[PDB]
Each structure stands twice: as structure tokens, then as C-alpha cells.
Design a protein around this ligand. Structure first.
Ligand code: 1N7
Ligand code: 1N7
Ligand code: 118
Ligand code: 118
Lengths: 268, 268
DNA sequence: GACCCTCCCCTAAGGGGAGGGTT
DNA sequence: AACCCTCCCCTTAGGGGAGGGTC
């Protein structure tokens, strides 16, 4: 049985037998020193059978080189089992997300927003929690709040990149008298002055949507994320953040403003 | 925004941005010509968010290039949906297989048979179907047929590699009235004088186990396969085959014999 | 004709490092 | 030192082909 007859026995490629013999797994019985031909015996067929049996399970080749000779190694199978469990969970996640994408595209010709999960680190922020009558008044009150803090603390250095955001501590849709908390990430701790405090905001896994446009139409964005959380079975773990990237401070065009809504979320 | 600041903005490595620029996926807004330094803008982060949102759905990079550059492309989302559902089926199958493997390797310290799900193509065999009083007597009466068919069919060449098996057409277990069919694959049709005839044996996907040793313990392997067939929810679609690799024809030691039991199954 | 060998290069999505540039 | 660049090799499980040899 030359390599061709063996490759037709196992229904495997000649390149596969070559690769195996190179890697050390399934070395043939006889390598003729005259011509280097590879001759296999039925024992190699029995060995290739279990090689293919493990390869049909998802085991990488390096795991098979450890499973075919180290007959005591059983933990490396439970490890692959946990990996496969994670993979089924992530594939179900992806499938739900794809179905939601298709539904949203069947609704409207244009996909306005696109959700993305990202891991946001913990960060040392200075914060001010207070009530606002409307959104515009809140936007107007932010800059003096920032100025007070940068003046009262010499050496206050913002974080690069500038992670400057807000949190909406309401649980229902509150149009006026919103319990809003403005925050800005700094390099390190400062001193509490006025109603402005400092705190450490924890790391989250947040589903985010970048809204490009004027602020008075941010509501749609929030609704979309809400729908995203309702459809794909995630759950809002904390108050929603809203991060400001571009705006009246960065670009004087009102239609080029960019804010990254971030729902802190966890899967259920 | 230099590549470091932007790479920290989007929270991905530098080499990823280099790669996305090389393939034309995410191009910097402004490259300094002599330095080659890459500088991005907010509307590069707006696109990296879309890239990552699509890449969390498992879309390969070229699919992302098309999804972002080619509009009305819902067919690629549909293709990826079908592929994810297929991978869900395959991963669940692997999970059941590895649960069964762990249930076995924990129950006994040696794994006697690994089970491999392989595809067997259709063949043209000569077959004799007949009642058998005793399986040991079943082995002896086969070489008479081997004499007879080569006598009556001159120039009949056996298939290479040799496929010589037995269909067990019995729907339940019995010890002295086994209704079997001995089949052996040849290349062309032939004359069907006698109870021996010629027929085409259809292609089957089948779980196979290689049994080494004498034929009196063979039922063990069969038991195992049935266990396997019931554990992973497979359905036995056809009659069980038994292919003879090594035996009295090749080897004198009754411990180096080799058969391959094949259960035609489908996943239901 | 059939069949076989080694050698080199290719995959997708970047990772790691080496050598060289500037402020 | 701090960033940044390009170039070259590397990762899986083998596929494809060229050039050259063997039954
Ligand atoms: C989804 C989210 C939590 C749901 C639980 C609900 C509860 C509180 C709601 C916000 C506030 O009303 C303030 C503001 C009102 C504007 O009109 C639209 C934007 C704002 C940010 C709202 C967005 C969204 O509607 C919020 C976050
Ligand atoms: C699982 C399968 C049906 C499904 C049942 C029905 C008929 C059964 C075979 C026959 O009895 C012949 C023979 C008897 C030996 O004792 C053990 C081996 C054999 C091959 C049996 C194996 C197995 O038990 C068979 C295939
Ligand atoms: C403290 C508090 C707010 C701001 Sb900004 C800002 C700057 C960079 C990145 C993100 C936000 C600001 C306003 C006027 C002039 C200069 C900077 C700011 C503005 C509106 C809403 C939220 C934040 C700055 C410091
Ligand atoms: C025609 C009929 C039977 C056998 Sb064989 C056999 C099968 C596959 C591969 C190699 C050999 C056989 C038996 C004794 C001596 C020489 C050949 C055979 C017989 C009984 C049961 C199964 C196979 C061969 C040709």
C-alpha cells in the first residue's frame, strides 16, 4: 500500500498524509531509502481512524498529537468541551444579531445606527449629579461646571482620549426635571469642591451606537438601543451613558456632531 | 489624531489599523507624505464603529468591504445567516459527541473504539443474500462464492481499494436465523446467474468503528455504535454494513484481524 | 501512463519583531 | 524615550503547482 492506495483507503488527500507524516502524527510504516516512498500498513489505517475521529470533534492538530499518545490526558477534552459551549453561545448570539439586522433592513432601506459591544475600562471621573429642566439647559450648564473644576484643582489633567460623558439615572422616559449626572474622565483623584465630587466609574460591557447629527434627535438612537436590548435578550445593567466626541466645541457645523451612546449591558 | 491616539480611541491595536489601511477597508483621512504618519478624523471612527459592528456578526473582512462599499447587499447578510445556522448545527453535534466521549473515557480507562462519521460512496457490488445458521459458518461459505463468480464472470476485477462487506438486513437481534447479504465491490456489471446478483449500493454517510481482534467479540462494537446512535440523536437510515479489512486472507494471528462496522445514519 | 518525491508559496486576520526615521 | 514607518517572518490544516524522479 503506497501513499496513493492508502489515501484512497482512508478517503484522505495525499497532501494530508504528507502533512501528517511531516508533523509527526501518523508516521508511515516504511520509508524506502532509495526513493523516499511512503508505505502504509493497516495499523496506520486504525490510527488514522481515531485521528479523523478526533478531528471531527474540533480538536486542533496540536491537541491530537497530545491525545493520540498521552492516554491519560482527559482534561484537554473537558477544555474543548467548555470551548464548544462558549462557541455555541457566541454563535447563538451572532444569529440573534443577524436576524435583528435583517429585520431592521427589511423595515427601512438605510441602516441608520449600528450597535457594537465593547469593553469600557474603569476610569477616574469627576462628576456632578443634578436635576435639569431640559436638555438644552443641561448643555448650557456643562461648560461653567468644567471651568470651576479646572480652576479649583491646579494640575488637573484630562485623560487621553477625552472620555467625557453623561449618565441618565432615570428609569422611565423623563422629558423634564431629569436626574442627570455629568462626568469627565481625568488622570487621577482630585478634591471635592462644591456639589462636584470625584468617583471611580466601573468597567462595563456596553452596547454602543454612534449618533452623528444634532442633539434634539438623539431620542431615536436611544430607542434603537432599547429595541436592540429587547430583541437580543441582553439586559441594561446600569444607567445609560452618553459620550460626547464631536460637537459645538470641536466642529462649528451643527450637522457634524458625533456622540457615542453606550448602554451598559449584560447578557441574560 | 495620530495613529496612537486614534488606536486608543477605537481600542484596537496598531497593527490592526495598519492592516485595515493595507486592504483599503479603513483608510486614514490624511497621510503625511514624507513621514508616512497616519492621521485619522472623527469620520474614521464613525467608520471603524461600523466595521466592528459588522465584524461582531462574524462577517469575514472581504464581506465587510462589500457590506460597507456595496449597497442593497442583504444577500450577504442572508448568506452569513445560513452559514451561522449551519455552524450552530455542527457545533451542537460536536458538543454532543464530546459529551459522549467524556461519558465513555470517564467510565473506562481505555477507549476501545472511536467513532468516525465518514462518507461512503455508492458502489457496484455482487451480492448474495441468504439465511445463516451460525455466524462462524457464515465465514466459511463465502470463498465458494468467490470461486464461482470469478468462474462465471471472466475478467471481473475487484475494486481497488477492496470493499468487501456484509449488509445485515435484520431489523432485530437474533443468533441463529441471521438474514445477511454478502456484498463485494467490483468495477463493472456482470452476469447474475444464481442467488448471487449484481447491484448498486447507494452512497451513505455512516458512523464507523474499527474493531481489532477475533470476530466473536464483534457484537461489542455493534452495541457501542447503537449507544452512539442513540446518544447523539442520529437515526439509523439503512441496514448496518460490516467491512472486512484484515482476516484469514492476510494474516495468521487471530489478534491482528480488522473489521470496520458502519452504521448508515442521518442527523435528525 | 501512473504514480511519487521535495520544495516553494498560498490561505485570514493580524502578531511579533527588526531596522531606521523624527523630535 | 516616544511614536511612527516599512519589511519579513509567523500563526491552521493543508491546497496547488513545478521540476524531477520512480514503478
Ligand atoms: C431608554 C432609557 C431608559 C429606559 C429604561 C430612557 C430613560 C430616560 C430617557 C432619557 C431621558 O428621558 C432624558 C432625555 C429625554 C430626551 O427626550 C431623549 C433623550 C433622553 C436622554 C432620554 C433617552 C431615553 O429615552 C432614556 C435614556
Ligand atoms: C443493531 C442492529 C439492528 C439495528 C442489530 C440487528 C441485527 C443484529 C446483528 C445480527 O443479529 C447478526 C450478528 C449477531 C451477533 O450476535 C452480533 C453481531 C450481529 C451482526 C448483530 C449486530 C447487531 O445487533 C444487529 C446488526
Ligand atoms: C469640562 C467639561 C466639559 C467640557 Sb466640553 C469637551 C471637550 C473635549 C471633549 C469632549 C467634551 C467644551 C465646551 C466648550 C468649550 C470647550 C470645551 C462639552 C461641551 C458640551 C457638552 C458636553 C461637553 C470640557 C471640560
Ligand atoms: C471473493 C470472495 C471472497 C473473498 Sb475474502 C477478502 C475480502 C476482502 C479483502 C481481502 C480478502 C478471502 C478469504 C480467504 C482467503 C482469501 C480471500 C472473505 C471471505 C469471507 C468473509 C469475508 C471476506 C475474496 C474474493
Amino acid at each position: 500500500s503506497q501513499i496513493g492506495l492508502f489515501s484512497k483507503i482512508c478517503r484522505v488527500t495525499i497532501k494530508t498524509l504528507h502533512y501528517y507524516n511531516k508533523i509527526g502524527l501518523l508516521v508511515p510504516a516504511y520509508i524506502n531509502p532509495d526513493n523516499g516512498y511512503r508505505f502504509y500498513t493497516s495499523d496506520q489505517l486504525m490510527k488514522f481512524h481515531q485521528i479523523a475521529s478526533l478531528r471531527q470533534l474540533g480538536f486542533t492538530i496540536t491537541e491530537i498529537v497530545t491525545l493520540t499518545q498521552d492516554e491519560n490526558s482527559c482534561h484537554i477534552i473537558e477544555r474543548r468541551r467548555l470551548e464548544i459551549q462558549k462557541q455555541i453561545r457566541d454563535m447563538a448570539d451572532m444569529l440573534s444579531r443577524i436576524n435583528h439586522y435583517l429585520q431592521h433592513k427589511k423595515k427601512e432601506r438605510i441602516m441608520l445606527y449600528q450597535a457594537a459591544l465593547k469593553e469600557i475600562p474603569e476610569c477616574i471621573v469627576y462628576s456632578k449629579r443634578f436635576i435639569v429642566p431640559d436638555f438644552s439647559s443641561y448643555i448650557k450648564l456643562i461648560p461653567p461646571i468644567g471651568q470651576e473644576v479646572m480652576k479649583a484643582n491646579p494640575g488637573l489633567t484630562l485623560t487621553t482620549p477625552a472620555y467625557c460623558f453623561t449618565l441618565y439615572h432615570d428609569k422611565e422616559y423623563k422629558e423634564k426635571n431629569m436626574d442627570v449626572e455629568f462626568c469627565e474622565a481625568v488622570n487621577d483623584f482630585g478634591k471635592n469642591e462644591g456639589n462636584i465630587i470625584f468617583q471611580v466609574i466601573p468597567a462595563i460591557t456596553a452596547v454602543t451606537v454612534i449618533h452623528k447629527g444634532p442633539y434634539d434627535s438623539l431620542r431615536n438612537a436611544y430607542i434603537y438601543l432599547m429595541q436592540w436590548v429587547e430583541d437580543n435578550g441582553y439586559l441594561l445593567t446600569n444607567s445609560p451613558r452618553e459620550s460626547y466626541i464631536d460637537g459645538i466645541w470641536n466642529k462649528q457645523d451643527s450637522a457634524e456632531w458625533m456622540t457615542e451612546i453606550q448602554f451598559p449591558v449584560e447578557k441574560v
